[PDB]
Amino acid sequence: METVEMVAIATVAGLLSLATVTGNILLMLSIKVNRQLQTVNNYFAFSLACADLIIGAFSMNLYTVYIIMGHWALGALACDLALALDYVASNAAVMNLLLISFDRYFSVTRPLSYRAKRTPRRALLMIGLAWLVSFVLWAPAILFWQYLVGERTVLAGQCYIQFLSQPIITFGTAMATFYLPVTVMCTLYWRIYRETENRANIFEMLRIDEGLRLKIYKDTEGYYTIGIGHLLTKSPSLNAAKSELDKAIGRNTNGVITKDEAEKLFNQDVDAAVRGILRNAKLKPVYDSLDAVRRAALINMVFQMGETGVAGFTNSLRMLQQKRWDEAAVNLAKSRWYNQTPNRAKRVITTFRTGTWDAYTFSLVKEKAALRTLSAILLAFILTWTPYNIMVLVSTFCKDCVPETLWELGYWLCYVNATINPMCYALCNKAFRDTFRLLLLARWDH
Ligand SMILES: CCCCCCCC/C=C\CCCCCCCC(=O)OC[C@H](O)CO
Ligand SMILES: CCCCC1CCN(CCCN2C(=O)CCc3ccccc32)CC1
Ligand SMILES: CCCCCCCC/C=C/CCCCCCCC(=O)O
Ligand SMILES: CCCCCCCC/C=C/CCCCCCCC(=O)O
Ligand SMILES: CCCCCCCC/C=C/CCCCCCCC(=O)O
Ligand SMILES: CCCCCCCC/C=C/CCCCCCCC(=O)O
Ligand SMILES: CCCCCCCC/C=C/CCCCCCCC(=O)O
Ligand SMILES: CCCCCCCC/C=C/CCCCCCCC(=O)O
Ligand SMILES: CCCCCCCC/C=C\CCCCCCCC(=O)O
Ligand SMILES: CCCCCCCC/C=C\CCCCCCCC(=O)O
User: Fold this and answer.
1) Does the beta carbon of 13 sit less than 6 angstroms from any atom of ligand 2?
2) Beta bridge partners of 233
3) 345, 368 in Cβ contact below 8 A?
4) Could you give phi then psi for residue 213, rounded to 5 degrees?
5) Which of 59, 146, 327, 354 gets the most CB atoms within 10 Å of its CB?
6) Which residues are annotated as a binding site for substrate?
7) CA-CA distance, 100 to 46, in Å (whole number)?
8) Residue 210 bears catalytic tag
9) CATH number of the domain that residue 321 is part of
């Protein structure tokens, strides 16, 4: 390698390492200095930043030395230890991406039962297990394969994993670390998006029909309430109501909350209502037989008159289960319910009749920062890791079709995931972008 080629590689790779270490330290410090970013799902983001910092500071720089020098010059022990660290960190990054996906999946699908289990303590446990599993999977095999086989067949000046002899063995690891995790995370995201779409529609339906209050008010029974009919306490005190509200949210609200915080309390109420319906012998067979649009209409009815109230419409419920919607509409309209709230009742009835959102003009699904960041980090993983994993796939069909130069570029592209991952958080999350800019401007002055 000529002197001009050595300088050019050192500059580009050096600047790449600097951008990787800076971005991941900015991600870690943002969570540390800003309390609003100290959420359970950001514990996994911090854990991912740690794996990416190892890639940026260690893997990128030791690989730059290996490229420039044209061989491994640090010995056999340093080779096995550097490979163990590189593969353990890369595998830990994938496991944190799986931890982000699964956490967001259970918090959107089950916001009541899972949120009782979703604590920093359990997050710290899952983070530690993801790091330990990654260590036990790679490090023993990398260090001790030579002793099992009886010879170290990796030549002096070379540095690669000996247990990955046949490309089919490498393909197995590619299936385990990329192909299967990607399929799982894409399936998870699909269910998350679908659940969010359905839950937002119920939120908008009840916002029109019941009403949304961002400040503490009193219900018909005189009890302190907030959002869309969310009971805070039955105690005749405002301080007791503020205490229950601060406990459920996680900040000093002082009686005033946001639409997003009200949507979070609403989704917990939806799960409690759906839990009731499935436990109710009169409401369970009709709910299971109904589509997502007509299910929301039933929940709306439950929110207004309760479980026993809706269950009292024996003939209407049976006709809805029989898919006789025009006939069910007749019985539901000839009730005390229709006489008390005719506008809300006719909108609910039309929904049962058509199975569409024609009674309300509904907006498209507003994708929150959480959902947006999830697809960004998942698309970033696929983008950067695809070239190397396709090269492994090519190798199984034809032995030496992939040249050494291409493996090197595939490895570099793979490392780029560590660089663009903090950029995804900055692009999708406003709170991250502002903290990043705050930390950088403070470092410049002074
Ligand atoms: C024939 C070759 C065998 C094929 C390999 C099959 C192994 C299945 C692995 C992951 C499934 C993805 C689901 C993710 C949940 C499991 C988390 C886990 O422990 O997987 C570790 C994985 O190696 C981290 O890359
Ligand atoms: C868990 C899934 C697999 C993830 C892959 C595994 C391969 N690495 C590139 C390894 C590059 N490399 C060398 O080729 C020689 C020695 C060396 C020392 C220190 C750092 C790097 C190297 C990118 C991610
Ligand atoms: C050197 C600065 C980095 C440039 C950015 C990366 C762009 C991709 C580079 C591809 C060119 C590498 C291929 C060179 C041919 C020599 C291959 C060989 O015979 O070993
Ligand atoms: C080379 C240096 C790179 C490391 C920089 C990252 C800074 C270290 C992070 C500190 C974490 C802040 C301490 C807060 C502990 C929270 C634990 C808890 O959940 O109770
Ligand atoms: C070589 C050194 C690297 C060590 C690898 C192990 C990484 C383990 C990850 C760290 C645990 C994450 C803790 C979460 C941060 C808490 C932030 C906060 O709420 O204040
Ligand atoms: C369940 C222990 C798995 C070991 C931790 C390693 C991290 C990678 C796995 C991610 C799954 C975490 C999701 C929480 C467990 C729910 C069980 C399930 O439905 O799969
Ligand atoms: C992944 C690490 C593998 C550990 C190998 C050690 C083998 C010996 C077996 C002992 C394991 C028993 C410890 C169980 C943990 C205590 C229960 C708990 O609180 O979770
Ligand atoms: C968070 C990381 C974001 C990733 C950044 C990638 C930005 C891609 C956009 C740059 C424009 C260059 C692509 C132009 C298309 C060329 C098409 C062609 O081949 O003719
Ligand atoms: C199994 C746990 C993983 C171990 C990770 C530690 C890896 C560190 C080793 C490699 C870097 C070598 C340090 C540079 C010194 C070279 C001096 C020389 O021998 O010429
Ligand atoms: C010198 C070795 C280089 C570092 C390699 C890192 C891999 C080792 C893995 C096992 C240690 C367990 C990880 C730490 C868990 C604590 C974090 C937490 O639980 O929040």
Assistant:
1) no
2) 224
3) no
4) -115, 120
5) 59
6) 231, 303, 316, 331
7) 11
8) yes
9) 1.10.530.40
